[PDB]
């Protein structure tokens, strides 16, 4: 008979069966059947300038390590937002109603890169 314990891919079926191997679509079908490739859907790779950048893929052996401290949501708040809040409260300018000046954002849909929906791929 046939092998039921192998990978079912496009190469096994007839000419009708053409399954992609995992690529992301970059367009659709137009009027005449010519593939209309949308410019926006193409992933535009963004690269910096490494000419004036001094850093190497390897680190010196004599460079000491450090105590592995994973970043915590509490430590980040105490590092960035706490000094601004603390100074304002001591000066009497703290406003519990509005916290947008400290980096808090009520709704994510306003900004370009959401967080909970995870808009950006990487």
């Amino acid at each position: 008979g046939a092998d039921r314990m192998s990978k079912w891919t496009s190469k096994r079926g007839p000419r009708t069966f053409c399954k992609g191997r995992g690529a992301k679509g970059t367009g659709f079908h137009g009027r005449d059947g010519k593939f209309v490739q949308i410019k926006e859907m193409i992933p535009e790779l963004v690269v910096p300038e490494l000419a004036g950048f001094k850093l190497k893929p390897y680190v010196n052996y004599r460079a000491p390590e450090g105590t592995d401290t994973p970043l915590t949501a509490k430590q980040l708040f105490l590092e960035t937002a706490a000094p601004a809040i603390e100074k304002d409260f001591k000066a009497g300018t703290f406003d519990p109603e509005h916290l947008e000046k400290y980096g808090f954002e009520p709704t994510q849909e306003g900004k370009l890169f959401q967080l909970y929906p995870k808009n950006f791929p990487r």
Partner: protein
């Protein structure tokens, strides 16, 4: 290896944990009470003890209910607590005769009924026993509000009761916006069935419906850690302020 808790108690212990635990106590108390329904098909014997005609001795007798099958079609109407009777029979009523499968079905009728509490007409598939119970209770609204869940055996009936029970507790002025005097008369007769609001919206709910309702009330978006940390910082600052 054997189960520590018997299998028959798995469903009962399912109610003691999770979302089922946070359900209101009054709803759970009514659900766990499995009272024997009013006999419909079988004819019970009043006496607990009977004398054997052959033996001429005092013996104990017990009523055993006859199982009855309720088709899903019944839940859309009011059958009065009855349904299909599944069983066997003997042809010619002789023991030494053939054994035959027999199904007895109730005779269904199409009627539209009027409810004073809701002032709406419902075309409900009713049986002759349901109409007799309506006359016995001296009112369609009385029949729904007096017969318990085990006697009604219809999800439409429970929802119909819940709709009217909420109507009385809320005292909605929408029953008759133009006849306030008529509104007072209608709710005066059913004043004995008035129940508080927290009890009137859970009488017609099944187990699945209640869990969805409980989740909807408890559906809360997570509180951002920015708000939690701001409150923590303010407490320390006020604590330091009061320390000087």
């Amino acid at each position: 290896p054997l189960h520590k808790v018997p299998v028959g108690l798995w469903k009962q212990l399912r109610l003691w944990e999770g979302i089922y635990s946070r359900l209101p106590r009054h709803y759970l108390r009514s659900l766990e009470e499995a009272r024997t329904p009013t006999p419909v098909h079988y004819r019970p014997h009043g006496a607990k003890f009977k004398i054997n005609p052959k033996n001429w001795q005092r013996e104990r007798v017990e009523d055993v209910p006859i199982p009855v099958h309720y088709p899903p079609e019944s839940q859309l109407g009011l059958w009065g607590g009855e349904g299909w009777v599944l069983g066997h029979r003997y042809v010619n009523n002789d023991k030494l005769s053939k054994r035959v499968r027999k199904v007895w079905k109730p005779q269904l009728f199409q009627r539209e009924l009027y409810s004073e509490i809701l002032d709406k007409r419902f075309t409900v598939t009713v049986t002759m026993r349901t109409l007799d119970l309506i006359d016995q209770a001296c009112g369609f609204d009385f029949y729904i509000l007096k017969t318990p869940k085990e006697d009604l055996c219809s999800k439409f009936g429970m929802d119909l009761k819940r709709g009217m029970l909420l109507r009385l507790a809320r005292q909605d002025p929408q029953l008759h916006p133009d006849d306030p005097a008529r509104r007072a008369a209608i709710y005066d007769r059913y004043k004995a069935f008035v129940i508080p609001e927290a009890e009137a919206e859970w009488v017609g709910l099944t187990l699945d419906e209640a869990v969805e309702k409980q989740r909807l009330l408890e559906e809360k978006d997570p509180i951002p850690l920015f708000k939690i940390f701001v409150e923590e910082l303010l407490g320390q600052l006020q604590q330091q302020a009061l320390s000087e």
